[PDB]
Subunit: 134 residues, 6 copies
């Protein structure tokens, strides 16, 4: 019975898929524990959230993107919520994300892929603290 | 061009209809300006919010219900947002709410009716400042 | 807190709208109290069910139709279930049934209109007894 | 058993609502008789199509809009299609179009309203001639 | 061309997912041959149905749950109905069930997983004769 | 950034699944480059289109099918469209096509499977030439 950190990304807002995305998690019975809306995320939280990636080439365009529009940060709660919401998520790569998954059905880009989801018990605690210090 | 305040009531959470409702508003092309998730709204906001209903016979049951579960406060923005989002909502009486409207399709009870939405300009400014001070 | 009698009509089965129809009643929170599936309704129950119409011109083609395919007979239960399920139903006439309603969204014919719904407290008791003698 | 002409406006394409719109009409049992897709329509057909509004203040802006993106021209067939696809359509004015209708659900602007539908019999032949000569 | 037996479990009724499930099967083009609504399935059918599970540590909780609410028994018919409807269903382990499948999209629990479906020819003939003698 | 050719087979029209199919592709962000609707396709284009199967036992029945009702020819554009719309498609064989895919969800037959999609780059130009010369 864990908690994971989801991010709804600015492309979700541009393409009006915010409810479609949250709806897939909702219909699988995961409950919202906490949720915050950001018209524009502070770049600092974004740099924090993606620190493991700071060395990568895409890290800068990634950060630009994440602040280019609103985002919603949600904490969901369920049994094995971390691994299950990741399988809903789908693969980052638009050439490997299966139909049925969020990214497989809706996304078509390596960078603008609608959603972020914690991928581990440690990833979650840390990301959740970043977005929900309280 | 206006802003209106929307409440997603506890029954929406119980029935897993949060996305369904927010999606109906999203497709009509309204923008989220602000949004806050309340695992349990403090009672004194609920009585503030419904302060014009305090002399009514249902008031106390309404407050009890508005704290029985989570709620989401949202400020929406758009052309004639106030009155357009009211029509989407549908009348309060389940015997009146039109099919096609959120309450018309989804609600079956005079109290537990999923959604709130400001009815006027002064009402919205008032309610927005309650949930978003 | 009443009970009403719904019929899902053979055209619903032909056009695969059975789940779509039952889904609209389900999403409005009315509960299934009883339900029976008929691969072909006995013409007698059909003649009974529509007795008030026995004098009409359409009564014969109506009966043919109702037995031309399967039908499901359901009893739903809710507050004011009778009047509410009728407003979901929509108007018999394809020139007056509003969008949003079952018939307004899905039906296009005076005869083959997908669904039947009791229209009164007396209509219901009687129809329910016809389809559910027990 | 009529026929009618239906346009899917550039805002549908912009908003990914093409199937959403066509699906509502398909769902009602109306059938595609013919259908062309235009990446960008000759402005002549547009001024032709909307010739009856040529005097209106909005005529020039409306046409600029109609050539701002792709459009799809469809002929639909079925009993009473013209008047029936017209109630599916809903009111031009976003203050009167009902929930349940394409515009009531999906449109929120006086000009950008996703769909056009023949309003009468002669309107229907008139416009079908324009798009499918 | 086969027949397979499907159970809509009590949790489907609790969550208002009956139509959602039946619709997923309906769209894959399978036909209802028989169907019965059980406001409360008699326990001895449930133990019959799950008779190969009687030595398992979950058996008693499974029976308790299979009578906690209504269920619908359905015989479906179609080409390779048995194995096609099994894939639609998805694995039992929520950690295994694929997105796109009924359990993959909708279920979150090893027990309360919405749906049953015969796994083989002998299994279906057996289960069909239980619910439809 | 590829292009690909997609056909909506007569069974889609028969089953009212045209928007359902096109919607899934639109939803994935692929764009219509051009699109013709055929009430009934010249059998020549069909034998052309399926020229590679001309020897197969099924070739004759498959073509009879492809002219049994209307079809819609679409060119789609987007990054990696060919291979991407191919996984949306799913397996020809109703015993291997996964839930989540058009065929896995909607098709239940080896011949009548709703949609065709170019399988390679040259296949794509090849077929686009046929339908849009
Ligand atoms: N060339 C790339 C690769 C990836 N990304 C972004 O970097 C994010 C995180 O990287 P990655 O780990 O590869 O994707 P995730 O699926 O989110 O996996 P995780 O965060 O758990 O590592 C992706 O969501 C994507 O938006 C990017 O902008 N450009
Ligand atoms: N010319 C007609 C008129 C109606 N009917 C059928 O008769 C049924 C019942 O008649 P009507 O009462 O007009 O329609 P309902 O909307 O079902 O209203 P109710 O049964 O409550 O009277 C309709 O559902 C329709 O299928 C028909 O076959 N041919
Ligand atoms: N008899 C009533 C009437 C209203 N109510 C609740 O009180 C709220 C305010 O009522 P209202 O008449 O202003 O209805 P709306 O403004 O929400 O349409 C409604 O949304 C209902 O949820 C109730 O519990 N019992
Ligand atoms: N004030 C207006 C009114 C309409 N229009 C556009 O012009 C079209 C013709 O208006 P109309 O009154 O015939 O509306 P419909 O026929 O589309 O219902 C509308 O569909 C709008 O797209 C506009 O640009 N500005
Ligand atoms: N550990 C378990 C395993 C199964 N079950 C239930 O027992 C049923 C039979 O289990 P199964 O392994 O045959 O799963 P399916 O055949 O339903 O895929 C499952 O559908 C579950 O609902 C349970 O309650 N606890
Ligand atoms: N045994 C078969 C196999 C395929 N077909 C049809 O012929 C088409 C070509 O088969 P294919 O193996 O290239 O399948 P896809 O390319 O469509 O995935 C299929 O889409 C079927 O419609 C058939 O009629 N009989
Ligand atoms: Mg009020
Ligand atoms: Mg007009
Ligand atoms: Mg088993
Ligand atoms: Mg091939």
């Amino acid at each position: 019975l864990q908690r994971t950190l989801v991010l709804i990304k600015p492309d979700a807002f541009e393409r009006s898929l915010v409810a479609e995305i949250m709806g897939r998690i909702e219909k699988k019975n995961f409950k919202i524990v906490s949720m915050k809306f950001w018209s524009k995320a502070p770049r600092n939280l974004i740099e924090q959230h993606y620190k493991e990636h700071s060395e990568q080439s895409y890290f800068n365009d990634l950060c630009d993107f994440m602040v280019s529009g609103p985002i919603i940060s949600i904490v969901y709660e369920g049994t094995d919520a971390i691994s299950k919401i990741r399988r809903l998520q789908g693969n980052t790569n638009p050439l490997a994300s299966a139909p049925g998954t969020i990214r497989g059905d809706l996304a078509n880009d390596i960078r603008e892929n609608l959603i972020h989801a914690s991928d581990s018990e440690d990833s979650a605690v840390d990301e959740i603290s970043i977005w929900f210090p309280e």
